[PDB]
């Protein structure tokens, strides 16, 4: 699962970028982290990300063409890997070492017996 | 998995009663009653115009809600993450594992029996 | 996989319902199967299903409150089961049965030793 | 995983179609690959694909009824198969022969004991 960190870096970073870039023009979505976070959560969610944010951004900032497309990909490519990361961390460790406690003592037991039958081998001398 | 089914129907239930408490004054449309707060939260659950269409417009008068929506979404998707995957595991489908701790944990018993049988014939 | 049928029944049926119901008021989305199919594909997709279709429907038809919510659920619950239906239809020794030839004879050996007895 | 190619063909192709078709009427979304790529990414994303693009296209091009519905299906059916393609690939040692070092010597030990008891039960009557 924890990516969870990475994701909260990506999420963190992209916001600070956006708030740097756009906040001048788009204080609505990008004036502060306060809304850049939301906005990128909203973009993460795919609720009116282009038609509602990106295209309208890009109407004055063509460079953002990538900022939105990128973040979406990057985001979904880590949530691809975290959603599947809990598919594997749910599908199974321990069954190994409890029968090396048995066997590596059962052996010890037979050495004990062998020197107890052999203690009555010393036993006649 | 369907232990969650309950939980989810609590989350779903609860969040609605909150919203209907909060917003219904301002947003009777989406929040006037459970009747529509249930829908609305289903709709927010669905991610069809949740922010642009509900939340941001809520938040225009209630900055409080900033979390109410973001939260519910997360909470919801994190239980449906776990229920959808809960049906991935409840669908997917051995014994010889505990059958060699029945061997070893009796083979041991056998060597103790021998050790007190070799030891039983030591006194003699 | 083939549910594929069922789904195409659900999908089929719900359209014929909607086109019966709404087409009067909402010929836009429901005037014919032609657009009721699309519309229900669009509702299946969760692109402006409520805000864009359902709520606006329901503004004159409160009965639809279920028609949309229902279809969505029903749909996702069959696509839940078909997408997972391809997760299972897609997921396609002696080292374990040997250590019960060593052990179930090593035992025999210790019984043989133990019947070392006067 | 790599479909990744196929997908980038589908994605590529459909854009060139759309840009052929619509870029007369809808230079907005279809004037160049530049925006037909985005647009098809946006349609891939299911953010206002019909209500925002397709229906509005189709208001003048009933042809497109399929172009959108098709691409969506085709897209999601390859991403169905690539997302599940990573459920099987990045999802799905030695202790095996380490307990035949134990067992195939523990046996040796019991033969050693058996000829050691053979030693002294013989050697004590
Ligand atoms: Ca949507």
XYZ file of C-alpha atoms and ligand atoms in Angstrom:
493
model
C 0.000 0.000 0.000
C 2.614 2.572 1.117
C 3.083 4.509 -2.967
C 0.557 6.188 -0.649
C 3.493 8.479 0.157
C 4.569 8.913 -3.485
C 0.991 9.692 -4.463
C 0.801 12.358 -1.725
C 4.029 13.781 -3.204
C 2.727 13.799 -6.802
C -0.562 15.212 -5.488
C 1.382 17.745 -3.396
C 3.840 18.710 -6.140
C 1.416 19.121 -9.038
C -0.659 21.479 -6.866
C 2.315 23.740 -6.129
C 3.123 23.820 -9.817
C -0.479 24.673 -10.784
C -0.770 27.287 -8.042
C 2.501 28.791 -9.328
C 1.311 28.761 -12.998
C -2.352 29.427 -13.081
C -3.300 31.219 -9.880
C -2.604 34.447 -11.698
C -5.262 33.720 -14.319
C -7.310 31.057 -12.506
C -7.430 32.048 -8.842
C -10.742 30.193 -8.875
C -9.082 26.747 -9.156
C -5.470 27.659 -8.635
C -5.189 30.796 -6.385
C -3.913 28.737 -3.442
C -3.057 25.203 -2.578
C -6.458 25.388 -0.803
C -8.242 25.120 -4.114
C -5.352 23.636 -6.203
C -5.508 20.636 -3.993
C -9.263 20.344 -4.500
C -8.945 21.105 -8.177
C -6.328 18.367 -8.597
C -8.539 16.055 -6.528
C -11.370 17.000 -8.823
C -9.086 16.426 -11.822
C -8.008 13.166 -10.245
C -11.697 12.296 -10.055
C -12.441 13.066 -13.746
C -15.376 15.262 -13.008
C -15.314 18.007 -15.589
C -11.523 18.062 -15.649
C -11.078 19.164 -19.273
C -14.360 20.801 -20.305
C -14.602 22.342 -16.815
C -10.983 23.147 -15.927
C -8.293 22.165 -18.436
C -9.624 23.353 -21.795
C -10.704 26.646 -20.080
C -7.189 26.884 -18.615
C -5.603 26.050 -21.900
C -7.681 28.769 -23.634
C -4.998 31.031 -22.127
C -2.312 28.453 -21.303
C -1.491 25.872 -24.051
C 1.439 24.674 -21.985
C -1.150 23.168 -19.509
C -2.162 20.734 -22.244
C 0.383 18.454 -20.563
C -0.073 19.550 -16.908
C -3.605 18.106 -16.913
C -3.021 15.154 -19.252
C 0.213 14.322 -17.393
C -1.253 14.551 -13.830
C -4.210 12.397 -14.861
C -1.935 9.729 -16.313
C 0.563 9.911 -13.443
C -2.253 9.821 -10.877
C -4.163 6.934 -12.500
C -0.860 5.051 -13.146
C -0.124 5.185 -9.343
C -3.747 4.362 -8.386
C -3.584 1.598 -10.985
C -0.587 0.400 -8.949
C -2.086 1.033 -5.475
C -5.543 -0.521 -6.193
C -3.645 -3.515 -7.584
C -1.124 -3.067 -4.712
C -3.909 -3.997 -2.273
C -5.077 -6.848 -4.629
C -1.677 -8.497 -4.026
C -1.216 -7.433 -0.377
C -4.605 -9.171 0.187
C -3.569 -12.439 -1.635
C -0.961 -14.461 0.326
C 4.495 -16.338 4.662
C 4.574 -18.044 8.086
C 4.050 -21.749 7.161
C 7.831 -21.988 6.540
C 9.543 -21.763 9.933
C 7.227 -23.677 12.354
C 8.315 -27.072 10.869
C 12.017 -26.139 11.110
C 11.341 -25.794 14.833
C 9.878 -29.317 14.761
C 12.460 -30.887 12.493
C 15.530 -29.054 13.833
C 14.537 -30.219 17.319
C 13.287 -33.695 16.335
C 16.775 -34.131 15.008
C 18.130 -32.887 18.322
C 15.902 -35.486 19.992
C 17.378 -38.351 17.956
C 20.929 -37.216 18.770
C 19.923 -37.162 22.417
C 18.591 -40.728 21.988
C 21.655 -41.788 20.083
C 23.906 -40.592 22.897
C 21.424 -42.129 25.425
C 21.576 -45.510 23.685
C 25.243 -44.805 23.203
C 25.478 -43.623 26.863
C 24.628 -47.282 27.331
C 27.364 -47.923 24.726
C 29.950 -46.122 26.787
C 27.838 -48.545 28.940
C 29.918 -51.356 29.149
C 33.183 -49.242 29.220
C -17.023 -8.988 1.984
C -20.752 -8.192 2.672
C -19.903 -7.277 6.260
C -18.838 -4.053 4.458
C -22.186 -3.938 2.646
C -23.589 -3.025 6.081
C -20.796 -0.512 6.867
C -21.238 1.124 3.510
C -25.007 1.452 4.171
C -24.080 3.121 7.438
C -21.581 5.544 5.861
C -24.099 6.165 3.095
C -26.847 6.552 5.704
C -24.890 8.770 8.066
C -23.398 11.158 5.560
C -26.900 11.808 4.212
C -28.289 12.756 7.618
C -25.363 15.102 8.107
C -25.817 16.749 4.721
C -29.581 17.001 5.202
C -28.932 18.632 8.553
C -26.350 21.067 7.101
C -27.373 22.057 3.637
C -31.093 21.442 3.339
C -31.562 25.036 4.501
C -29.613 26.408 1.543
C -29.742 23.390 -0.853
C -33.187 21.812 -0.441
C -32.655 20.750 -3.986
C -29.999 18.164 -3.135
C -30.258 18.126 0.639
C -33.851 19.046 1.738
C -34.595 15.473 2.805
C -32.928 12.131 2.975
C -35.045 11.484 -0.148
C -32.684 13.615 -2.218
C -29.635 13.542 0.116
C -29.523 9.808 -0.495
C -29.690 10.306 -4.260
C -27.259 13.235 -4.072
C -24.773 11.163 -2.142
C -25.353 8.309 -4.620
C -24.682 10.822 -7.302
C -21.595 12.063 -5.433
C -20.646 8.430 -5.010
C -20.949 8.039 -8.739
C -18.710 11.086 -9.560
C -21.173 12.622 -11.915
C -20.793 16.350 -11.504
C -20.096 16.008 -7.819
C -17.910 19.117 -7.431
C -18.708 21.372 -10.329
C -22.381 20.367 -10.006
C -22.925 20.012 -6.227
C -19.907 20.582 -4.074
C -18.246 23.721 -5.348
C -21.800 25.225 -5.606
C -22.487 24.138 -2.027
C -19.139 25.445 -0.928
C -19.789 28.815 -2.501
C -21.833 29.333 0.655
C -20.488 26.530 2.887
C -16.617 26.204 2.969
C -17.301 23.625 5.751
C -18.412 21.194 3.031
C -14.975 21.229 1.421
C -14.378 18.133 3.506
C -17.943 16.705 3.524
C -17.689 15.987 -0.152
C -13.968 15.174 -0.398
C -14.297 12.990 2.676
C -17.445 11.065 1.585
C -15.898 10.400 -1.802
C -12.709 8.998 -0.259
C -14.542 7.042 2.421
C -17.004 5.682 -0.138
C -14.403 4.736 -2.767
C -12.181 3.225 -0.087
C -15.022 0.879 0.996
C -15.983 0.122 -2.634
C -12.291 -0.371 -3.314
C -12.540 -2.959 -0.540
C -15.909 -4.452 -1.565
C -15.158 -4.774 -5.276
C -11.870 -6.417 -4.300
C -13.884 -8.212 -1.589
C -15.746 -9.954 -4.442
C -12.438 -10.569 -6.323
C -11.317 -12.755 -3.399
C -14.729 -14.216 -2.535
C -14.789 -15.404 -6.179
C -11.261 -16.806 -6.571
C -10.804 -20.535 -5.829
C -4.351 -27.524 -0.541
C -5.006 -29.416 2.726
C -1.575 -31.180 2.578
C -0.159 -28.177 4.529
C -1.424 -29.335 7.989
C -1.061 -33.016 6.964
C 2.781 -32.830 7.428
C 2.416 -31.214 10.855
C 0.293 -34.257 11.646
C 3.238 -36.440 10.456
C 6.003 -34.487 12.187
C 4.101 -33.671 15.368
C 3.357 -37.393 15.735
C 6.728 -38.661 14.455
C 8.143 -36.598 17.288
C 5.650 -38.289 19.614
C 6.930 -41.610 18.282
C 10.584 -40.778 19.126
C 9.597 -39.749 22.659
C 7.782 -43.061 22.982
C 11.014 -44.763 21.794
C 13.177 -42.631 24.047
C 11.158 -43.670 27.094
C 11.033 -47.245 25.673
C 14.852 -47.360 25.418
C 14.938 -45.453 28.642
C 12.183 -47.762 30.081
C 14.511 -50.670 29.445
C 17.542 -48.917 31.038
C 16.460 -49.425 34.656
C 16.459 -53.117 33.611
C -18.099 -14.042 -20.204
C -21.458 -14.936 -21.787
C -23.878 -12.463 -18.884
C -23.008 -10.718 -22.149
C -26.469 -11.878 -23.218
C -28.170 -10.875 -19.939
C -26.544 -7.459 -20.094
C -27.832 -6.986 -23.661
C -31.286 -7.898 -22.303
C -31.100 -5.454 -19.370
C -29.698 -2.834 -21.745
C -32.417 -3.723 -24.278
C -35.287 -3.817 -21.809
C -34.504 -0.655 -19.876
C -34.426 1.241 -23.178
C -37.897 0.034 -24.186
C -39.207 1.048 -20.803
C -37.631 4.520 -20.999
C -38.788 5.025 -24.578
C -42.317 4.033 -23.492
C -42.182 6.400 -20.435
C -40.251 9.472 -21.293
C -40.272 9.830 -25.077
C -43.414 11.914 -24.669
C -41.631 14.486 -22.517
C -38.013 13.691 -23.450
C -37.943 12.790 -27.139
C -34.416 14.160 -27.003
C -33.067 11.188 -24.979
C -36.028 8.846 -25.146
C -38.026 9.468 -28.396
C -36.835 6.168 -29.911
C -34.694 3.218 -29.036
C -32.225 5.019 -31.342
C -31.500 7.573 -28.611
C -32.753 5.562 -25.579
C -30.017 3.060 -26.352
C -27.411 5.820 -26.525
C -28.913 7.560 -23.481
C -28.737 4.346 -21.462
C -25.205 3.800 -22.758
C -24.494 7.352 -21.642
C -26.175 6.626 -18.265
C -24.191 3.383 -18.135
C -21.067 5.492 -18.657
C -21.857 7.982 -15.851
C -21.376 11.019 -17.961
C -23.901 13.566 -16.740
C -26.467 10.850 -16.040
C -28.278 12.677 -13.203
C -27.521 16.358 -13.562
C -27.769 15.929 -17.336
C -30.571 13.392 -17.764
C -32.152 11.931 -14.656
C -32.772 14.909 -12.386
C -34.056 16.785 -15.460
C -36.290 13.791 -16.234
C -37.393 13.559 -12.692
C -38.331 17.238 -12.645
C -41.481 15.942 -14.389
C -41.228 12.240 -13.617
C -40.458 11.345 -9.912
C -41.154 7.714 -10.799
C -37.800 7.749 -12.789
C -35.947 8.295 -9.537
C -35.611 4.517 -9.574
C -35.385 3.925 -13.340
C -32.025 5.673 -13.429
C -30.699 4.612 -9.992
C -31.860 1.063 -10.687
C -30.373 0.771 -14.238
C -27.045 2.144 -13.002
C -26.880 -0.380 -10.171
C -28.125 -3.280 -12.293
C -25.694 -2.361 -15.067
C -22.621 -1.954 -12.800
C -23.545 -5.089 -10.911
C -23.467 -7.118 -14.154
C -20.292 -5.361 -15.353
C -18.888 -5.927 -11.873
C -19.632 -9.600 -12.606
C -18.446 -9.616 -16.234
C -15.183 -7.746 -15.668
C -14.515 -10.151 -12.783
C -15.932 -12.892 -15.044
C -12.920 -12.243 -17.329
C -10.550 -12.070 -14.302
C -11.409 -15.720 -13.594
C -11.790 -16.890 -17.205
C -8.357 -15.307 -17.739
C -6.481 -16.793 -14.750
C -5.474 -19.924 -16.661
C 3.449 -31.531 -7.287
C 5.558 -34.537 -6.069
C 7.897 -32.156 -3.952
C 4.763 -31.882 -1.738
C 3.635 -35.545 -2.339
C 7.224 -36.810 -1.887
C 7.837 -35.652 1.678
C 5.137 -38.167 2.560
C 7.303 -41.013 1.144
C 10.388 -40.062 3.302
C 8.277 -39.265 6.449
C 5.722 -42.115 6.194
C 8.628 -44.539 5.852
C 10.959 -42.779 8.366
C 8.103 -43.317 10.793
C 8.001 -46.957 9.741
C 11.743 -47.067 10.430
C 11.293 -45.786 14.016
C 8.551 -48.361 14.667
C 10.918 -51.001 13.380
C 13.548 -49.606 15.792
C 11.021 -49.409 18.594
C 10.127 -53.093 18.143
C 13.793 -53.411 19.120
C 12.595 -54.677 22.491
C 13.145 -57.345 25.094
C 1.343 -5.301 -20.932
C 2.531 -4.706 -24.478
C -1.594 -4.201 -26.201
C 0.170 -0.953 -25.207
C 1.116 -0.800 -28.880
C -2.372 -1.765 -30.149
C -3.951 0.812 -27.887
C -1.594 3.506 -29.257
C -2.713 2.430 -32.729
C -6.446 2.561 -31.890
C -5.829 5.875 -30.100
C -3.743 7.063 -33.050
C -6.150 5.875 -35.752
C -9.399 7.101 -34.270
C -7.862 10.573 -33.950
C -6.902 10.706 -37.616
C -10.427 9.620 -38.526
C -12.046 12.252 -36.311
C -9.658 14.957 -37.507
C -10.532 13.935 -41.048
C -14.295 13.970 -40.339
C -15.098 16.679 -37.904
C -12.272 19.249 -38.105
C -14.391 21.104 -40.690
C -17.291 21.536 -38.309
C -15.514 21.011 -34.924
C -12.031 22.506 -35.230
C -12.451 23.027 -31.521
C -12.064 19.309 -30.715
C -11.027 17.943 -34.070
C -9.115 20.641 -36.063
C -5.792 18.808 -35.613
C -4.428 15.693 -34.078
C -3.253 18.172 -31.392
C -6.801 18.446 -30.040
C -8.231 15.194 -31.548
C -5.736 13.326 -29.430
C -6.802 15.254 -26.308
C -10.460 14.994 -27.296
C -10.158 11.232 -27.696
C -8.247 11.115 -24.395
C -11.099 13.148 -22.927
C -13.592 10.758 -24.540
C -11.478 7.889 -23.259
C -11.789 9.474 -19.832
C -15.616 9.806 -19.937
C -15.609 13.432 -18.969
C -18.484 15.024 -20.864
C -17.920 12.768 -23.855
C -21.549 12.701 -25.107
C -23.268 15.728 -23.606
C -20.041 17.736 -24.154
C -18.650 16.354 -27.463
C -20.562 13.518 -29.113
C -24.235 14.630 -28.989
C -23.026 18.134 -30.032
C -21.039 16.535 -32.896
C -23.940 14.332 -33.794
C -26.300 17.330 -33.933
C -24.647 17.790 -37.337
C -23.066 14.350 -37.908
C -25.363 11.341 -37.141
C -22.479 9.304 -38.673
C -20.533 9.906 -35.394
C -23.170 8.099 -33.296
C -20.853 5.119 -33.772
C -17.462 6.894 -33.854
C -17.875 7.865 -30.224
C -19.731 4.772 -28.967
C -17.301 2.565 -30.855
C -14.073 4.275 -29.634
C -15.311 4.172 -26.044
C -16.059 0.443 -26.251
C -12.877 -0.377 -28.157
C -10.797 1.733 -25.750
C -12.359 0.365 -22.543
C -12.173 -3.192 -23.908
C -8.383 -2.847 -24.439
C -7.929 -1.082 -21.065
C -10.135 -3.787 -19.555
C -7.530 -6.162 -21.027
C -4.434 -4.101 -20.128
C -5.430 -3.291 -16.534
C -6.208 -7.013 -16.115
C -3.050 -7.666 -18.181
C -1.107 -6.086 -15.275
C -3.211 -8.030 -12.688
C -1.761 -11.232 -14.157
C 1.812 -9.990 -15.175
C 3.334 -7.944 -12.313
C 1.109 -9.853 -9.861
C 1.599 -13.618 -10.619
C 11.991 -20.525 -3.608
C 14.895 -22.414 -2.035
C 13.384 -23.901 1.205
C 12.183 -26.850 -0.927
C 15.588 -28.643 -1.097
C 16.606 -27.388 2.406
C 14.255 -29.908 4.112
C 15.604 -32.755 1.984
C 18.953 -31.910 3.540
C 17.247 -32.275 6.955
C 15.087 -35.267 6.089
C 17.662 -37.152 3.965
C 20.118 -36.844 6.878
C 17.578 -37.346 9.700
C 16.888 -40.618 7.960
C 20.618 -41.286 7.920
C 20.601 -40.549 11.641
C 17.904 -43.171 12.303
C 19.834 -45.815 10.378
C 22.857 -44.860 12.432
C 20.673 -45.306 15.626
C 19.224 -48.553 14.356
C 22.736 -50.036 13.934
C 23.738 -48.337 17.176
C 20.853 -50.101 19.034
C 21.723 -53.087 16.967
C 25.125 -52.499 18.562
C 23.906 -52.510 22.157
C 20.949 -54.464 22.623
C 23.159 -57.177 21.103
C 25.993 -55.864 23.351
C 24.070 -56.049 26.697
C 22.638 -59.564 27.102
Ca -18.417 12.230 -15.201
